[PDB]
Amino acid sequence: YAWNRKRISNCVADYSVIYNFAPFFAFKCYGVSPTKLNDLCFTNVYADSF
Amino acid sequence: NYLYRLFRKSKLKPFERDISTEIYQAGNKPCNGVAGPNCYSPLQSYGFR
Numbered sequence: 001y002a003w004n005r006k007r008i009s010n011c012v013a014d015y016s017v018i019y020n021f022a023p024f025f026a027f028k029c030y031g032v033s034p035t036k037l038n039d040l041c042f043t044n045v046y047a048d049s050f
Numbered sequence: 051n052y053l054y055r056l057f058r059k060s061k062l063k064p065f066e067r068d069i070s071t072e073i074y075q076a077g078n079k080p081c082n083g084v085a086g087p088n089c090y091s092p093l094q095s096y097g098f099r
Binding site for chain 2 (some may be wrong): 016019023027031033034035042
């Protein structure tokens with residue numbers, strides 16, 4: 001209900017650390033492929049944790 | 051019933067069909083042909099409703 005949101009801006013996005021953090025029950029990506037993420041540059045990334 | 055190829059190593063040539071149902075390595079770790087985190091099946095079905 002009080003899900004945490006962190007705004008991400010002005011930094012380099014190293015998704016490899018996200019990939020290797022733990023075994024994941026789901027890593028479903030909607031509207032973007034997982035591989036292209038490193039070669040893509042986005043204006044803002046929002047991380048929501050709950 | 052309708053599936054699309056989400057993952058491939060390289061772009062296809064014009065008028066070329068790829069029907070190979072082989073696993074793709076999306077992560078630095080080798081998949082070794084078994085599904086795992088960082089390993090995904092290339093072909094996904096559309097959710098048509």
